[PDB]
Design a protein around this motif. Structure first.
Motif, mmCIF file in Angstrom:
data_model
loop_
_atom_site.group_PDB
_atom_site.id
_atom_site.type_symbol
_atom_site.label_atom_id
_atom_site.label_comp_id
_atom_site.label_asym_id
_atom_site.label_seq_id
_atom_site.Cartn_x
_atom_site.Cartn_y
_atom_site.Cartn_z
ATOM 1 N N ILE A 280 0.829 -1.210 0.000
ATOM 2 C CA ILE A 280 0.000 0.000 0.000
ATOM 3 C C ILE A 280 0.864 1.262 0.000
ATOM 4 O O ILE A 280 1.942 1.289 0.603
ATOM 5 N N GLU A 281 0.371 2.301 -0.678
ATOM 6 C CA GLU A 281 1.081 3.578 -0.765
ATOM 7 C C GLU A 281 0.126 4.726 -0.451
ATOM 8 O O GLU A 281 -1.059 4.660 -0.786
ATOM 9 N N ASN A 282 0.647 5.767 0.203
ATOM 10 C CA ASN A 282 -0.169 6.929 0.576
ATOM 11 C C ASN A 282 -1.404 6.475 1.367
ATOM 12 O O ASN A 282 -2.508 7.009 1.195
ATOM 13 N N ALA A 283 -1.202 5.481 2.231
ATOM 14 C CA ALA A 283 -2.288 4.943 3.043
ATOM 15 C C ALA A 283 -2.677 5.913 4.153
ATOM 16 O O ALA A 283 -1.820 6.554 4.763
ATOM 17 N N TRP A 284 -3.980 5.987 4.413
ATOM 18 C CA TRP A 284 -4.513 6.853 5.459
ATOM 19 C C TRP A 284 -4.915 5.981 6.647
ATOM 20 O O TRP A 284 -5.655 5.013 6.476
ATOM 21 N N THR A 285 -4.404 6.308 7.838
ATOM 22 C CA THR A 285 -4.705 5.508 9.038
ATOM 23 C C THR A 285 -5.491 6.310 10.070
ATOM 24 O O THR A 285 -5.435 7.541 10.098
ATOM 25 N N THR A 286 -6.214 5.582 10.924
ATOM 26 C CA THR A 286 -7.015 6.189 11.986
ATOM 27 C C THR A 286 -6.843 5.392 13.276
ATOM 28 O O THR A 286 -6.385 4.246 13.239
ATOM 29 N N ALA A 287 -7.214 5.995 14.409
ATOM 30 C CA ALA A 287 -7.099 5.318 15.702
ATOM 31 C C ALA A 287 -8.361 5.523 16.538
ATOM 32 O O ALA A 287 -8.741 6.658 16.835
ATOM 33 N N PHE A 288 -8.999 4.411 16.919
ATOM 34 C CA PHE A 288 -10.211 4.458 17.730
ATOM 35 C C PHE A 288 -10.094 3.500 18.910
ATOM 36 O O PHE A 288 -9.542 2.404 18.778
ATOM 37 N N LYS A 289 -10.636 3.915 20.055
ATOM 38 C CA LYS A 289 -10.617 3.087 21.274
ATOM 39 C C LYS A 289 -9.176 2.766 21.701
ATOM 40 O O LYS A 289 -8.913 1.718 22.303
ATOM 41 N N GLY A 290 -8.247 3.679 21.394
ATOM 42 C CA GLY A 290 -6.840 3.488 21.753
ATOM 43 C C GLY A 290 -6.205 2.349 20.950
ATOM 44 O O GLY A 290 -5.272 1.698 21.426
ATOM 45 N N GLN A 291 -6.718 2.115 19.736
ATOM 46 C CA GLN A 291 -6.202 1.050 18.874
ATOM 47 C C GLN A 291 -5.676 1.629 17.564
ATOM 48 O O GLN A 291 -6.186 2.642 17.076
#
Length: 124
Positions: A71-82
């Motif tokens: 994967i390239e230019n991937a967008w990440t997120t964090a919920f519930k401290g994960q």
């Protein structure tokens, strides 16, 4: 830009990493006010370790265990401290093996690992 997947940083606009698919689930549709989307839950790793990875749309249903995905230019997120990763049409997905390194099999993905240089040569 050349960030560890196991220790990646959530809420990152751009992430470039190559990982092997070890665990994946069947994509399921999620009803929302803005519409419905087919998302799949999977965990992948190779750069240093494994992290949560959820794909959106046809990409969500195009994953498979044992299949190496890059994967390239991937967008990440964090919920519930994960820590998790989000991808879709905007993100670029292609099949590729460890860049400069032997392969995910030689690099333990179960737990965070140390490595020298992400890859010998590459672009972006």
């Amino acid at each position: 830009m050349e960030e560890k997947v196991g220790n990646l940083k959530p809420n990152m606009e751009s992430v470039n990493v190559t990982v092997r698919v070890l665990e994946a689930s069947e994509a399921r549709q999620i009803q929302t006010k803005n519409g419905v989307r087919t998302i799949s839950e999977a965990i992948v790793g190779d750069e240093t370790g494994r992290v949560k990875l959820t794909l959106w749309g046809k990409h969500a249903g195009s994953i498979k265990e044992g299949q190496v995905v890059k994967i390239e230019n991937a967008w990440t997120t964090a919920f519930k401290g994960q820590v998790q990763l989000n991808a879709g049409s905007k993100t670029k997905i292609a099949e590729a093996s460890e860049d400069g390194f032997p392969e995910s099999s030689q690099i333990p993905e179960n737990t965070p690992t140390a490595e020298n240089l992400y890859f010998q040569s590459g672009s972006h």
